[PDB]
Amino acid sequence: VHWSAEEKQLITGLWGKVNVADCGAEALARLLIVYPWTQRFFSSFGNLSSPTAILGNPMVRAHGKKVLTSFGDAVKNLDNIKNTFAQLSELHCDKLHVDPENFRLLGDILIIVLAAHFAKEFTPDCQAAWQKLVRVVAHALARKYH
Amino acid sequence: VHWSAEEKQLITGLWGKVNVADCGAEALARLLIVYPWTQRFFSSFGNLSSPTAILGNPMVRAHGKKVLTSFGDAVKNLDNIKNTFAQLSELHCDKLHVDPENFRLLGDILIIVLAAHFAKEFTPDCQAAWQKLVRVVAHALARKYH
Amino acid sequence: VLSAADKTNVKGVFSKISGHAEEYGAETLERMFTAYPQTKTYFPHFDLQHGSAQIKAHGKKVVAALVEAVNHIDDIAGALSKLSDLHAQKLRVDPVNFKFLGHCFLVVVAIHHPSALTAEVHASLDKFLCAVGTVLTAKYR
Amino acid sequence: VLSAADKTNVKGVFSKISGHAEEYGAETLERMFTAYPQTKTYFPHFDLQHGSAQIKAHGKKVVAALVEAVNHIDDIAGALSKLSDLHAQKLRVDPVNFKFLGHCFLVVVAIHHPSALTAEVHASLDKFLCAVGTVLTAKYR
Numbered sequence: 001v002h003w004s005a006e007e008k009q010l011i012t013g014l015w016g017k018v019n020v021a022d023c024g025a026e027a028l029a030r031l032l033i034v035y036p037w038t039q040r041f042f043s044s045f046g047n048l049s050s051p052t053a054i055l056g057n058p059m060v061r062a063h064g065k066k067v068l069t070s071f072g073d074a075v076k077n078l079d080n081i082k083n084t085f086a087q088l089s090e091l092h093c094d095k096l097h098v099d100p101e102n103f104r105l106l107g108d109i110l111i112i113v114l115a116a117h118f119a120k121e122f123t124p125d126c127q128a129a130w131q132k133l134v135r136v137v138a139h140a141l142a143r144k145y146h
Numbered sequence: 147v148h149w150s151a152e153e154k155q156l157i158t159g160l161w162g163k164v165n166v167a168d169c170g171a172e173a174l175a176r177l178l179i180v181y182p183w184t185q186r187f188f189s190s191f192g193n194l195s196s197p198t199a200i201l202g203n204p205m206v207r208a209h210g211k212k213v214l215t216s217f218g219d220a221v222k223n224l225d226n227i228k229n230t231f232a233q234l235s236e237l238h239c240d241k242l243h244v245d246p247e248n249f250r251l252l253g254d255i256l257i258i259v260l261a262a263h264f265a266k267e268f269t270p271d272c273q274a275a276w277q278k279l280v281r282v283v284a285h286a287l288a289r290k291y292h
Numbered sequence: 293v294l295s296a297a298d299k300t301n302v303k304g305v306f307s308k309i310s311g312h313a314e315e316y317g318a319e320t321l322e323r324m325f326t327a328y329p330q331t332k333t334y335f336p337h338f339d340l341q342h343g344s345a346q347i348k349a350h351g352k353k354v355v356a357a358l359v360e361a362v363n364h365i366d367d368i369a370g371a372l373s374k375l376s377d378l379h380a381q382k383l384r385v386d387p388v389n390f391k392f393l394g395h396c397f398l399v400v401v402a403i404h405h406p407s408a409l410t411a412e413v414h415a416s417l418d419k420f421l422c423a424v425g426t427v428l429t430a431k432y433r
Numbered sequence: 434v435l436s437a438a439d440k441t442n443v444k445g446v447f448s449k450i451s452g453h454a455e456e457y458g459a460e461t462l463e464r465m466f467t468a469y470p471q472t473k474t475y476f477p478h479f480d481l482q483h484g485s486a487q488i489k490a491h492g493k494k495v496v497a498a499l500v501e502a503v504n505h506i507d508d509i510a511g512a513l514s515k516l517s518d519l520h521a522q523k524l525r526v527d528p529v530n531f532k533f534l535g536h537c538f539l540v541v542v543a544i545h546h547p548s549a550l551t552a553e554v555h556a557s558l559d560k561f562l563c564a565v566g567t568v569l570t571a572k573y574r
């Protein structure tokens with residue numbers, strides 16, 4: 001993909017502010033809550049019996065931040081995502097067999113979460129920049145199926 | 147992508163039997179009938195007022211075979227689809243702005259059509275081979291959006 | 293929701309395949325595993341070798357249920373409430389796989405009753421399956 | 434279909450945004466055109482420059498309708514029958530775009546009432562929108 005000089009600006013700045021801990025937890029939680037079927041891939045996390053029972057789960061919260069800091073490597077070299085996630089695509093594709101449709105799903109929630117934490121600093125241009133990032137990442141994860 | 151030696155066999159043989167005229171028409175027709183919204187991109191075809199009013203439309207039938215013979219170039223060099231459809235992806239992406247989701251849709255109908263014309267000669271292995279082709283083609287058409 | 297016509301067409305094409313549950317169900321399943329291999333993930337405990345007794349038995353059950361839904365095509369939810377629990381709450385089946393199964397089913401009908409699957413029915417059948425698949429995961433709706 | 438809870442949650446978060454149709458509608462629209470540019474294709478006749486009177490007027494209309502649907506959250510179809518004609522039969526809006534608009538809407542609520550959009554409501558809102566979008570293209574169901 002091609003990244004305009006501002007797109008990078010927009011992304012790396014916001015990155016510096018992001019609390020991967022809170023955002024990451026908030027996101028993985030919401031994914032499990034809104035799209036229930038995703039719970040299947042996290043049977044190893046014990047209780048997911050209820051929404052509120054999920055916000056608290058520390059395994060959810062832990063993995064949440066782990067997933068989010070991966071984007072840290074994306075922002076690292078926005079012109080090398082494919083190669084930096086091949087191994088990541090490999091397990092999600094050949095191992096877990098996650099349907100690419102869920103990558104899209106998570107990416108969307110992630111956007112909403114950022115919008116709630118940076119309020120008015122999450123400008124339309126900014127939203128678009130992350131939308132793009134989120135998709136170019138999922139395309140790097142998918143790919144392994146083609 | 148990687149094509150097993152039989153996948154190619156399975157594909158090129160069936161290709162030789164295919165009546166692009168009937169199949170192509172049958173297909174584009176069904177797409178318009180099952181997923182109505184697609185009609186929007188074919189406003190230039192006049193009447194599409196009814197199912198039966200569509201089977202007959204000669205513009206539908208004409209374009210139907212045109213779309214199907216394109217697969218002829220696919221079968222041509224199953225290891226070069228991307229480069230051979232770049233110009234095809236360009237108009238579908240930058241020009242018409244067809245959402246990739248419809249490429250999937252058409253590909254599916256195409257499969258069903260073949261299954262009705264070759265009956266029991268359309269073996270599971272054969273279905274899988276075309277499924278693959280159909281998807282690797284749509285991925286070549288999409289791509290232009292990423 | 294399914295219109296009157298949609299209901300009529302669905303009933304029609306099912307009249308032609310009735311008496312083949314065993315055979316067709318087994319075929320759509322085998323085509324699903326063959327073209328959408330990742331769907332295998334849901335049947336570790338299944339004998340997947342072509343023409344297995346399991347696949348046949350299950351095949352028959354699957355279409356038997358779709359048939360059951362046609363008889364109560366006015367209350368698909370009620371008719372399959374017990375199965376939506378199973379596929380949604382229990383197995384947590386990804387809504388995406390329901391597409392693969394419906395697809396293969398249409399392929400099977402096309403091969404054996406190409407005259408029964410006119411384009412009009414094709415659309416009625418498609419709305420039927422999205423409706424069914426909705427309910428079967430629909431717990432989320 | 435929407436459960437009792439889902440209905441309650443939807444009503445709740447709409448109580449907090451009510452009195453902002455004009456403002457929010459305009460914002461979700463602008464975010465949609467900005468992040469999903471291809472959606473522009475449907476408004477050649479629109480003044481798309483940020484903060485345009487058209488976008489504001491339409492924005493207001495859009496949410497005004499979503500609100501209307503909440504008041505009749507028991508018969509969304511009836512409530513929007515006239516609009517499903519428009520978006521389905523007339524404009525032939527690709528069902529895929531309804532996703533883009535609902536997404537942006539949630540982004541707008543998140544930015545202004547982050548407390549009002551708890552994860553529970555988030556799910557209720559999501560089922561509401563898929564329901565609405567279904568009906569608005571649903572002519573095909």
Ligand code: HEM
Nearest residue numbers: 038041042044066067070071096098102103106137138141
């Ligand atoms: C593009 C978004 C995503 C990114 C960046 C991502 C990233 C990661 C990372 C960094 C790991 C590392 C290995 C580990 O700690 O286990 C992981 C594991 C995993 N991911 Fe994701 N993931 C994404 C989307 C998804 C989705 C949508 C699902 C499906 C519900 C999923 C399911 C899993 C599972 C089940 C594991 C195994 C974790 C474990 O071993 O407990 N991921 N992911």
Ligand code: HEM
Nearest residue numbers: 184187188190212213216217242244248249252283284287
């Ligand atoms: C992968 C499947 C597809 C292939 C192989 C394909 C191929 C073609 C070809 C070969 C043309 C050549 C130029 C021409 O004769 O106009 C064409 C034009 C076009 N295609 Fe497709 N197409 C595909 C899917 C779609 C879908 C899903 C739609 C959307 C409803 C679509 C809409 C069009 C339109 C509107 C044109 C313009 C035709 C005209 O100018 O009258 N195509 N396509």
Ligand code: HEM
Nearest residue numbers: 331334335353354357358375383385389390393424425428
């Ligand atoms: C509308 C299509 C479908 C129908 C009507 C359907 C129906 C059924 C039925 C009737 C059973 C019950 C067996 C019994 O209790 O005797 C069942 C079980 C099950 N279904 Fe499906 N199903 C459909 C789609 C799916 C899909 C998309 C998948 C997976 C890709 C799936 C996975 C399963 C699994 C794994 C079981 C396991 C039962 C066992 O352990 O033998 N189903 N389904």
Ligand code: HEM
Nearest residue numbers: 472475476494495498499516524526530531534565566569
């Ligand atoms: C649930 C979300 C949506 C709602 C409730 C909605 C509602 C409306 C309303 C109320 C109007 C009527 C204007 C009037 O008659 O005064 C309208 C018009 C229209 N809608 Fe939407 N809409 C939605 C989604 C979409 C989407 C996804 C698109 C396009 C990407 C779209 C494209 C249009 C267009 C182009 C018109 C044109 C009206 C004009 O010429 O000014 N709508 N919509």
